[PDB]
């Protein structure tokens, strides 16, 4: 769905003789609130020895985009599970917001490398501030000055089943 980027904060358990466990925050991409709490324990159990019954979640926050109408180049580090063993991948997306860029990534992974939602891990999504350090080629070609490209051979969608005009393109 429309992903929403969430901050989840976790505090293991207040016990006698160990007060104040430190605190643990993460940034989670999930389609709603309830998945992001469950996606939180999926990673945080891998990092150190906790459980959901030995845990509680402090607070959740919805992180909006800082600047939607600005156009950003994004470099995304991705770890994912293949049919063979897992291996890393670095990909670059040009998009409008952070949370819309992950939308175009999962579609890109499912198209080319046939990876569903459960196999992919999102390592770090970063904005590349300066230009001319863009590594990939297919992102780089839009950075040329005075870029103008035509859209030839446009089709037309007409509601009536019969048209009399012998219809023509552009």
């Amino acid at each position: 769905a429309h992903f929403k980027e969430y901050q989840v904060i976790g505090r293991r358990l207040p016990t006698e003789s160990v007060p104040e466990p430190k605190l643990f925050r993460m940034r989670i991409f999930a389609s709603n609130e309830v998945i992001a709490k469950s996606r939180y324990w999926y990673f945080l159990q891998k990092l150190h020895k906790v459980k959901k019954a030995s845990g509680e979640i402090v607070s959740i926050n919805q992180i909006n985009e800082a600047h939607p109408t600005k156009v950003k180049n994004f470099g995304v580090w991705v770890r994912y599970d293949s049919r063979s063993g897992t291996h890393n991948m670095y990909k670059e997306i040009r998009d409008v917001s952070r949370v819309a860029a992950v939308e175009t990534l999962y579609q890109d992974m499912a198209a080319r490398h046939r990876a569903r939602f459960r196999s992919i891990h999102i390592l770090k999504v970063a904005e590349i501030e300066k230009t001319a350090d863009v590594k990939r080629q297919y992102v780089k070609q839009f950075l040329t000055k005075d870029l103008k490209f035509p859209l030839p051979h446009r089709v037309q969608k007409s509601t009536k089943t019969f048209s009399y005009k012998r219809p023509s393109t552009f």
């Binding site: 051979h153 089709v155 037309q156 007409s158 019969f162 048209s163 009399y164 219809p167």
Partner: protein, 197 residues
Amino acid sequence: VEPVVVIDGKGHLVGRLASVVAKQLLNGQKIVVVRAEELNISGEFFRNKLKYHDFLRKATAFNKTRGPFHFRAPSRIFYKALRGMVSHKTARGKAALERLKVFEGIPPPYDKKKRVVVPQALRVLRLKPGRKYTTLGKLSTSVGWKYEDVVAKLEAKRKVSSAEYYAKKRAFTKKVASANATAAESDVAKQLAALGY
């Protein structure tokens, strides 16, 4: 919206045309399809020949007469692809195929009337550019239709007769548009413009 609708067959795909025709026949509209020999099939030529040959060998072993009749004419090829879509064994399917008439070329009286096209079945709107297609008129010549040297000759006779009509029609519209232009600026013309005509 009209009693009998005449579909021009040129530049369409076999399947995507026959789908939208078969729904109109079951809804009661009468459709007559002309210029069948200009119909197109997606995919390259050598494919669609072999899709015909593996069909061509399928016939009843103990008596070849009783088997699938392999028709060759481009109207008959197209009428096949439509016949599989209508439920032709019931009484509803027999009365739905009596509303259909498919011809090679344009025979009289259908040359005097308007021909139409179907935008969701045009080749030039459907396929991507740089993609091989196949002309059905060449295809039936490769599997035994001994009439492409005749139907194409009658079209060259027709189009000369049709070009004389259009020049007479275009000069008459020139007189009307000139008469309509000088009829403008009158008080009856300006009141129409306010109302939008």
